[PDB]
From Swiss-Prot, chains A, B, C:
Miscellaneous section: Regulated intramembrane proteolysis (RIP) occurs when an extracytoplasmic signal triggers a concerted proteolytic cascade to transmit information and elicit cellular responses. A membrane-spanning regulatory substrate protein is first cut extracytoplasmically (site-1 protease, S1P, this enzyme), then within the membrane itself (site-2 protease, S2P), while cytoplasmic proteases finish degrading the regulatory protein, liberating the effector protein.
Keywords (A to Z) from UniProt: Cell inner membrane, Cell membrane, Hydrolase, Membrane, Protease, Serine protease, Transmembrane, Transmembrane helix
Name listed for the protein in its UniProt record: Serine endoprotease DegS
Disruption phenotype: Small, slowly growing colonies. 5-fold decrease in basal sigma-E (RpoE) activity, loss of regular growth regulation of sigma-E. No proteolysis of full-length RseA.
Domain topic, free-text comment: The PDZ domain probably binds peptides ending with C-terminal Tyr-X-Phe sequences, which activates proteolysis. In the absence of OMP peptides the PDZ domain inhibits peptidase activity.
Reactions mediated catalytically: Acts on substrates that are at least partially unfolded. The cleavage site P1 residue is normally between a pair of hydrophobic residues, such as Val-|-Val
Length: 184, 184, 184
């Protein structure tokens, strides 16, 4: 008949880029950022990791290398052997997230698998030492280190644990990722 | 002046079909499925029921007959004496629910009466023995056995208790209802 | 590229009118209602207040006078010295809030500052002595006494504490405010 109001479009372009992270010693989410095979995630996920294992929604499974992390922003960067065509998380550094914007929270809890929740940008600004993004989309261990995107699928932030949920603005998460790629 | 974003349309066509269920010995929700007077609900609602009483939003009140239930899917089917014109829950078996679709949860808790909550389809797939639908719309005893419909009002599922809520896909709930109408 | 689904418009026209309320003896939210400088809030906020202090999002800070309150509806009315141009909360007394309508909850918790959450009108009707509005938007002490507006920004209600949140219909809140301006 007609067309149901839906944010499925955003799911198809963003969700395949979000990933499951495992420990395989003798669990959380992550986000493929670029073709080079760099993935963002959370420290509390990969701490004391023995072997890091990444699993995509297309069925591919890799062993990840821990590039570097940042206790301050709780973020961590992994590195997998990028092969032929990787799903990457849509990014627009020219986009200015506005408060009230619709956002989808994407994460693959070890229980249910990939789960999309819906809310809006509740607030932004600074609250710490040196920048956060608040949202009423459910944000727990199940989707921590996951993506947070607008109705267009553009990456707004990386779900974090710093009725209200938090994310790290994609603009900051980028900078942090880039610096962690440093190799003194 | 202008027109507020609203999913009221879906409410007008679906909500009148959702019903209050009572015990009247010496409480939950249900859904009128067809003109014949068949209503879907939950087992944990009608278990050990003495007299089942159905109440519509138009003010009509019937005594319901328990056709049959299914402990596996927690569903149950009731039967009331369908009179002149019943409100039935819109159904489209040609509709494929997509993840991210907007959905409304409809249920009449014994406290507040009919209550509509809003979310999206978080996830689908299988997780049990032989099929579920996950959503971030509030789903509790207040709306259990209630309807879950898209922005068009089309039935997506039957609220169940198997920050995340669950429903039984309308495609499966149909089959289950049909089989329960069996009378060895 | 394109335009993200967003209720930011409603934020820009309504949010500047919502206010922080402080005690400054030796905390909650409020809503500027009219140019005269009348502000609505909650009793449990200004009870036993020594000095009431109002703070706008534009940086202006006033000392408020308690006009009057109402234990029944938990509302309270303050009065600040309206100067040149005040931000007032959009009001449409010709608008009929429908169930399913999108609504934004606006409040400035003492912790995070102004926070917008999103939901819909779950239910209305009466439930008390002499009229409420239910919604699945988060409603806590952080946004109590705050505004609740539709996607157009029009005031629907005043967040109250009477998974479900409550507000006082703007039509009633108006009448109550007007009567409290009485001075026997």
């Amino acid at each position: 008949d007609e067309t149901p109001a839906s944010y499925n479009l955003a799911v198809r372009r963003a969700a395949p880029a979000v990933v499951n992270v495992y420990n395989r010693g003798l669990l959380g989410s992550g986000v493929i950022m670029d073709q080079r095979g760099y993935i963002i995630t959370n420290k509390h996920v990969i701490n004391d990791a023995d072997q890091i294992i990444v699993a995509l929604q297309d069925g591919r499974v890799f062993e990840a290398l821990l590039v570097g992390s940042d206790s301050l922003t709780d973020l961590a960067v992994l590195k997998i052997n990028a092969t032929g065509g990787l799903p990457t998380i849509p990014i627009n550094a020219r986009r200015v997230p506005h408060i009230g914007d619709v956002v989808l929270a994407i994460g693959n809890p070890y229980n249910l698998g990939q789960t999309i929740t819906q809310g809006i940008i509740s607030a932004t600004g600074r609250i710490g030492l040196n920048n956060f993004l608040a949202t009423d989309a459910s944000i727990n261990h199940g989707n921590s280190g996951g993506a947070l995107v607008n109705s267009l699928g553009e990456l707004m932030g990386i779900n974090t644990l710093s009725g209200i949920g938090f994310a790290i603005p994609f603009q900051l998460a980028t900078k942090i990722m880039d610096k962690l790629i440093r190799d003194g």
